[PDB]
Design a protein around this ligand. Structure first.
Ligand code: CYC
Ligand code: CYC
Ligand code: CYC
Ligand code: CYC
Ligand code: CYC
Ligand code: CYC
Ligand code: CYC
Ligand code: CYC
Ligand code: CYC
Ligand code: CYC
Ligand code: CYC
Lengths: 160, 172, 237, 162, 159, 162, 172, 162, 159
């Protein structure tokens, strides 16, 4: 769903026409879409650098990459990079849509089930998503970093 | 000489890192409160000589040994020196009100001030009686609303009662 | 406005007559007079030795020196006594000495740098302290230079100097312009991270081996991408 | 350390007179621009690592000399390039200090007070830093009024260098 | 961008929906600015390759170092020829309005090519970043934004 | 003569350094104040003869002493009452000068510089003028912000008298 | 030291009468023009060292006897004194720009300045060549608009060109 | 201007006493020394054009930077290279002046008195001259004792540069 | 104090009785004085820890003595850090108006912690008493009373 599609749905289930508050919501979305698109472009620029900096901030040189940790095996390191790239990409989609429903529908659906099945540590994942959020808020600026951090904190809060 | 702006610098310089946006928002009170600082000092120095001469009748009300013959505030030269020092605290107080931090008052008013009363013979603890007999007149002149639109300067006011309380405690 | 209260002058070296002008040792300071200029390098020496009394050598810097005053002194528009006043009533002096020093300390330092004489006792420092507080600092400096101890002894046109320092320590070296529990617990935090034990499979164990192998990488080629001529430089086959 | 509030103090203290209306307007002026300078302060600390590594590379582009010849002065070794981010990392600190102080005070003592005497000794050519700051002058990305006042303290350090 | 909407509506059995016709009309309107941006990047190519080689060999000296790939005049000429190729594909993507005719020629199999050539891909990404910086200095603000668009796509693609 | 512009000059001249940003903000504050102070300046010159003859009678009401006893000091004769409008006529001039100057400058030199030494000689009791000004303090009829700043220079001359 | 505010005082004091409402309305330009004064001095002192060193290559462009051996600007101390005096005019010019009236420049920069060139031997009229070779760079830096909001800055540029013209005429 | 004879004068004049035996030995030492220094003086003036054009090329060899980039500071144009022989031509003059004077006197005033302030302005990097003189230090071809004393004033100007 | 009344009326099946609403309204009224007292204790923390360490090590020198726990710079830094923690919890209790968020973090298991650390609890109580004396000197009378309230709770709790 969108913010546009959410506004249209909320006006639809009442049978209501588009009143002035919904037009205010759509015009606010059409105002913010500029920096939304620019932020999505520069996040699509260097996603690999963001994931590299995030694991170098949070996960590297810990016991997690040591033997016994969950990132010791090299296929598990590759799976870690894959999961962080997923979090960043779906946070980019939720930032450009302006509605976190795609995070609820595509990422946060059965994810705690999987992470408790595999024995994946949840708190280290939350700290890695936090480091992702700090790196991309530094990279994109504060004004779009707020909206990026909202959906990354949404993923972090639903994960916990 | 220091400030509330430059103590934040020197606190950050001894750490040696850029100032955070959490730090500057707390400093953004002061540019709003600079509207409130700038007239409370203007209220004191407008009525500066009224505070001094009214509190000259308060230390001399309670302790009449000072104009007793043989007293330490007794003679005309000595009594003119009392008034010479009755408002030498008020300029150093009103400097600290404008600066907002008491590092001006602590190296010019109180730095070694206690030492001379053990040297001359003038009673140190008696000056601490009359100095906080100024602040009830200083706060009482600075607090009452006349003309100026109603606003809350109570938070700022505590600061003013703190500077007299600091200067009186470090004398006696 | 009130007169200075009468205080106690102690015995010191300056009070003594120190009779004669053939008799002094060489250690007596070279009294630089603006009247005997001779060559530029006596002007440059007069200006530098004025800074030295006032700023204690290290300070001269670049910013501290008022460049304009030095030019005027060479011209002769302002006397040397007028020039040290302009140095002492400078804020490059004020942010240096006055902001760091106590009122009673400031009497002792200014008397050693402008008058060349240490304070007699503490009550002489207490006696002048009142003068600084009411007149201002430039009220006091202007009261030193106008005073009778300055004008008879240093005259109109001599830089100040410590007089009769035969059995004493030079003033600049003896007296300067000056006068944390969370850190020691933070170094406790750094020392307790090294003492556990490096875990197995660390990067530090192989660090020593890397040093043994050495091999700093190769230096830059230095060929510039503006002069490569890449369209002509590519070969077929 | 200099501040338009503490200039209203020391000018009032050497005269030996009270704080009249002619010193309160000096602090009044700083308050008006206090909000303005802080918007330049937030503009620089958010771009800390962007401006430093941008300007450090901007020195090497115009000066390919300092990256090549061996010596303790230049930055051929990594320890030179490590001390490259020391200096320009320290340059942007005091510029951010001078904006929050409202004056040239901390920039006077911390940076330019003995700067003409170190560079004569350590062979640090002042044309290196003076064009490092010109990259910070152009690439800070600030707009409006705060872009002017952040531009003021930059070319105050330039005239102290040259 | 017309092939994108055409195969997009062609996978469906429906026609081209008129919102897609609106985006084609808007691209048709912006085509003149696209052509001016492409000609401005066209005529100034050797400056851009020079400044890109400048900023790259200042940034990463290992290609200059003899263990790296771009050692010697022949290899550094091949390196600047690769940067010339990527600038050419960026101009193609600027005209086409969508990144299909540039990804089809420069992106879609580049990782295994550069892996079996020995060169690192991150240095190529830094070279396209240097091209983006030099073209940002060459163009106006609304032109550098729209060029840094496709340059940004290439930089994200090579990583 | 003191002025917040000329305080930015003389503090810059004794240091021997240029006009940095920390003196330009001092002249910035005065400009904002100057517009406000001029509204107090027009409020006083329109009420010139009203305030002077109002305050001169306000001295005689609280002090019936000076109107009765013979002497060259008091105003029993008309030449005393003629010199009554001399002094308070001259008092309101420099108050209007100090508002347009923006500082306590002309009030420092023209009025209060030697005022403590004349009154010891001519038997002019300073309690006469200090309550003459209190009538001007209450009866100027100004409002808003300019009523405060015109009130500032009045009780600056009061503290110089007492 | 004088001002545009205090010359009006001293003009009115020598008359000795209250200021008219015709007089204050003309002075109300200056509180509006104080927005325009305060940055044209900030424009000059930001580029102060660029003006001096570029105009050091203009007097030395046209008159190459100055670094000729035997010249008056010849040796290193003499040439360092030229730069010592190449911007000692600019601070006294920018003081008069901020003050708005040239009584600061006339008792500190030009008062007896001509007398020393007849005393030392340095050519007086040559300094007047290079000083108005600063003002075409001074006006040319202060007039161009990049970034700043459009305004009628032309009005006091004729003041700025007048102060260099006054200082150059009273040297040679 | 400093001279071991004029150091015996000014030290005798500030004391206000005659020329004792403890200043005549100061003059005496220089006379023995002067004959030796003059052999270094003839060694340099005979090699005037040889040393200048040798050292000027010796700057460009170690520094290929100053011959290439455009600017008024460097010597890409011929007028830079014309002013190249101005400076190093003037450097060898005062070195020959300091040998015949017997002291560091003319080298103090003529060369190093304001040298730290010009080079901060005109972007003349002092590492250029400090290695220009090192070529004169090695290639003067002097021998014996005069080769040491001509080597003394050269690295006195070096420590003033760095 | 709102959680106190809410769980108090929540154990019962009744609503919040309006006398509890009166006490919540009165606490809401006094919250501004609470915030000023907390900020005054906030900005002057290092003075309070300095004077507390002063009065404690003057009162009990056995922590200074090598048989005691706070011997050496590291242990005395940990000691002043503990006093800093307790001042922080006192400011929390000053804002919250009731001693629950300070007892939950500093009181509820402190005796066994300090027993298995070796430190005596009476010296910690004397340290909080010294903090109360220094804050009583720092504040006005009605502020020192209301601060010595929660300081008094901590002193009674550590014993
Ligand atoms: C789009 C949303 C989405 C997510 C996140 C997702 C995750 C996911 N992560 C997995 C494994 C994994 N996930 C992790 C990740 C981590 N373990 C750690 O220690 C770190 C805290 C964290 C990385 C930041 C690791 C190490 C494995 C490897 C377990 C294994 O395969 O043996 C698996 C098992 C199979 C496979 O990777 O191919 C799934 C399905 N699937 C999804 O569809
Ligand atoms: C440095 C020279 C200077 C002064 C003196 C100054 C004071 C000053 N105080 C103001 C406001 C004010 N000042 C006060 C002060 C108080 N009200 C009370 O009832 C309390 C008892 C007291 C504080 C203890 C208040 C309440 C306002 C209302 C407007 C505002 O918030 O600024 C304003 C707002 C603008 C105006 O009044 O025109 C000014 C100018 N401004 C200056 O430029
Ligand atoms: C040893 C020499 C010496 C003298 C003479 C002296 C006088 C002197 N008289 C004073 C007050 C006073 N002086 C007087 C005297 C008079 N007022 C009148 O109404 C009458 C006309 C007049 C007496 C004939 C009065 C009534 C006070 C108290 C005034 C007040 O408290 O405001 C005061 C200030 C307050 C004080 O300590 O009491 C001093 C210092 N001080 C000295 O050290
Ligand atoms: C006004 C109070 C006052 C006094 C007294 C004073 C004394 C004084 N005595 C001095 C030296 C001296 N004083 C003496 C005195 C003596 N030798 C003996 O055998 C006798 C026992 C004794 C004299 C009765 C000697 C020999 C020296 C020179 C010591 C030296 O230079 O090593 C000096 C150092 C040189 C100089 O005269 O400037 C001072 C300052 N200064 C003062 O301001
Ligand atoms: C044609 C280019 C050129 C210039 C400008 C020049 C200036 C010059 N100015 C000099 C001195 C001077 N110049 C000044 C100037 C001033 N003092 C002040 O306070 C004012 C700010 C300022 C006058 C407006 C003074 C005072 C001296 C002599 C200082 C001294 O000898 O102590 C000297 C020293 C010897 C001599 O004059 O003969 C030179 C060579 N030489 C040149 O070749
Ligand atoms: C800026 C900080 C500062 C202070 C405060 C200061 C005080 C100071 N007070 C002094 C004397 C004095 N102070 C007093 C004061 C008093 N007599 C009384 O009865 C009252 C209780 C009290 C005043 C309220 C008296 C009577 C003297 C003269 C004592 C004597 O000469 O014996 C003196 C010696 C003479 C002089 O004024 O120079 C100093 C230096 N100096 C400083 O630098
Ligand atoms: C807080 C304000 C502050 C600054 C900025 C500062 C700079 C400063 N940089 C220095 C050296 C240095 N500075 C640099 C920096 C550079 N050299 C280059 O080649 C590049 C062109 C350029 C960086 C862009 C280097 C490489 C050194 C070491 C040079 C040496 O050791 O000789 C030194 C002398 C040695 C030192 O302690 O490290 C100082 C004092 N000091 C200060 O207190
Ligand atoms: C238009 C689509 C297209 C691409 C992308 C392309 C790449 C390409 N790069 C090549 C070589 C090369 N490419 C590079 C690349 C670099 N220098 C470096 O250090 C960096 C890593 C990078 C550029 C800055 C180098 C050094 C060689 C020579 C390698 C060799 O000779 O083995 C070659 C083999 C030689 C040739 O026939 O040109 C191809 C085909 N060719 C194409 O037609
Ligand atoms: C009598 C003793 C004496 C010396 C030596 C001296 C040097 C001197 N050289 C200067 C400039 C210069 N100096 C040089 C010399 C050099 N720049 C280079 O690129 C080369 C590396 C190097 C020569 C080897 C050049 C090219 C200029 C002109 C720079 C400019 O105009 O900005 C200048 C400033 C402008 C001038 O008047 O020409 C001085 C004062 N002045 C003195 O009074
Ligand atoms: C190129 C010719 C030119 C100049 C010179 C120019 C200046 C200029 N400065 C202005 C404003 C201003 N200029 C300043 C500058 C400052 N205020 C302070 O207190 C600071 C110390 C200082 C900056 C350091 C301020 C505060 C304003 C307020 C209006 C605005 O934001 O533009 C405006 C707004 C329009 C107007 O004033 O009519 C003009 C015209 N405009 C031009 O066309
Ligand atoms: C906010 C709630 C909270 C409390 C209460 C707390 C107590 C606490 N006190 C500790 C140590 C300590 N605590 C003290 C205490 C003292 N010095 C003395 O002599 C006195 C008895 C007393 C203070 C004046 C000492 C000496 C140590 C170090 C003991 C050791 O190293 O074994 C430690 C272990 C080291 C550490 O990680 O800091 C904890 C956890 N920590 C908390 O997070």
């Amino acid at each position: 769903q969108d913010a546009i599609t959410a506004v249209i749905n909320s006006a639809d289930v009442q049978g209501k026409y588009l009143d002035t508050a919904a037009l205010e919501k759509l015009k606010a979305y059409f105002s913010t879409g500029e920096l939304r698109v620019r932020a999505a472009t520069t996040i699509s620029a260097n996603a690999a650098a963001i994931v590299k900096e995030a694991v170098a901030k949070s996960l590297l040189y810990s016991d997690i990459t040591r033997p016994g940790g969950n990132m010791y095996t090299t296929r598990r390191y590759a799976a870690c990079i894959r999961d962080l790239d997923y979090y960043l990409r779906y946070a980019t989609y939720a930032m450009l849509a302006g509605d976190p429903s795609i995070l609820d529908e595509r990422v946060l659906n059965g994810l705690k089930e999987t992470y408790n099945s595999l024995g994946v540590p949840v708190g280290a994942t939350v700290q890695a998503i936090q480091a992702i959020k700090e790196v991309t808020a530094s990279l994109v600026g504060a004004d779009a970093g707020k909206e990026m951090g909202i959906y990354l904190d949404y993923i972090s809060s639903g994960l916990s | 000489t220091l400030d509330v702006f430059t103590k934040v610098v020197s606190q950050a310089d001894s750490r040696g890192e850029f100032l955070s946006n959490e730090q500057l928002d707390a400093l953004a009170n002061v540019v709003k409160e600079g509207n409130k600082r700038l007239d409370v000092v203007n209220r004191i120095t407008s009525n500066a000589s009224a505070i001094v001469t009214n509190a000259a009748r308060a230390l001399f009300e309670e302790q009449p040994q000072l104009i007793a013959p043989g007293g330490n505030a007794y003679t005309n030269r000595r009594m003119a020196a009392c008034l010479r020092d009755m408002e030498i605290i008020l300029r150093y107080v009103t400097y600290a009100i404008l600066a907002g931090d008491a590092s001006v008052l602590d190296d010019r008013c109180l730095n070694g001030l206690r030492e001379t009363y053990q040297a001359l013979g003038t009673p140190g603890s008696s000056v601490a009686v009359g100095v906080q007999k100024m602040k009830d007149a200083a706060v009482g002149i600075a607090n009452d609303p006349n003309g100026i639109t109603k606003g809350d300067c109570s938070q700022l006011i505590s600061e003013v009662a703190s500077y007299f309380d600091r200067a009186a405690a470090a004398v006696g | 406005a009130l007169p200075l209260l009468q205080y106690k002058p102690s015995s010191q070296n300056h009070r003594v007559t120190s009779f004669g002008a053939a008799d002094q040792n060489e250690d007596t300071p070279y009294i630089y007079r603006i009247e005997d200029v001779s060559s530029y390098t006596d002007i440059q020496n007069i200006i530098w030795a004025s800074y030295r009394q006032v700023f204690s050598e290290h300070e001269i810097l670049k910013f501290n020196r008022q460049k304009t005053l030095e030019s005027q002194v060479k011209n002769g528009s302002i006397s040397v006594r007028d020039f040290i006043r302009g140095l002492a009533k400078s804020e490059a002096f004020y942010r240096l000495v006055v902001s760091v020093n106590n009122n009673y300390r400031l009497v002792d330092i200014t008397l050693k740098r402008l008058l060349g004489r240490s304070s007699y006792n503490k009550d002489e420092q207490i006696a002048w302290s009142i003068v600084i507080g009411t007149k201002g600092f430039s009220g006091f400096v202007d009261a030193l230079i106008d005073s009778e101890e300055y004008t008879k002894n240093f005259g109109e046109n001599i830089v100040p100097y410590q007089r009769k320092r035969m059995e004493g320590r030079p003033h600049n070296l003896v007296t300067p312009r000056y006068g944390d529990w969370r850190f020691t617990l933070d170094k406790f935090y750094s020392r307790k991270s090294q003492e556990k034990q490096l875990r197995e499979g660390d990067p530090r164990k192989f660090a020593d081996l890397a040093a043994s192998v050495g091999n700093q990488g190769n230096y830059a080629q230095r060929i510039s991408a503006f002069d490569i001529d890449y369209l002509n430089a590519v070969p077929n086959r | 350390v200099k501040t338009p509030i503490t200039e209203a103090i020391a000018a009032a203290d050497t005269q030996g007179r009270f704080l009249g209306n002619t010193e309160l307007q000096s602090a009044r002026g700083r308050y008006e621009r206090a909000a303005a300078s802080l918007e330049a302060a937030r503009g620089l600390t958010s771009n800390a690592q962007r401006l430093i590594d941008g300007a450090t590379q901007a020195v090497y582009q115009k000066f390919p000399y300092t990256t090549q010849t061996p010596g303790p002065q230049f930055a051929a070794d990594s320890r030179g390039k490590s001390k490259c981010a020391r200096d320009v990392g320290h340059y942007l600190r005091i510029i951010t200090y001078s904006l929050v102080a409202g004056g040239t005070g901390p920039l006077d003592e911390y940076l330019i007070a003995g700067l003409a005497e170190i560079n004569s000794t350590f062979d640090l050519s002042p044309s290196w830093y003076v064009e490092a700051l010109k990259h910070i002058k152009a690439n800070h990305g600030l707009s409006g009024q705060a872009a002017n006042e952040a531009n003021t303290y930059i070319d105050y350090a330039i005239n102290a260098l040259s | 961008i017309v092939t994108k909407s055409i195969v997009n509506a062609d996978a469906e059995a429906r026609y081209l929906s008129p919102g897609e016709l609106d985006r084609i009309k808007s691209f048709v309107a912006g085509g003149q600015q696209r052509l001016r941006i492409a000609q401005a990047l066209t005529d100034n190519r050797e400056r851009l390759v020079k400044q890109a080689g400048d900023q790259l060999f200042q940034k990463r000296p290992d290609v200059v170092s003899p263990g790296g790939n771009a050692y010697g005049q022949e290899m550094t000429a091949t390196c600047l020829r690769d940067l010339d190729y990527y600038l050419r594909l960026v101009t193609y993507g600027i005209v086409a309005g969508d990144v299909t005719p540039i990804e089809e020629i420069g992106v879609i199999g580049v990782r295994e090519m550069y892996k079996s050539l020995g060169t690192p891909i991150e240095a190529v990404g830094e070279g396209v970043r240097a091209l983006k910086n030099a073209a940002s200095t060459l163009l106006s603000a609304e032109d550098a934004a729209e060029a840094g668009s496709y340059f940004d796509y290439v930089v994200g693609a090579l990583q």
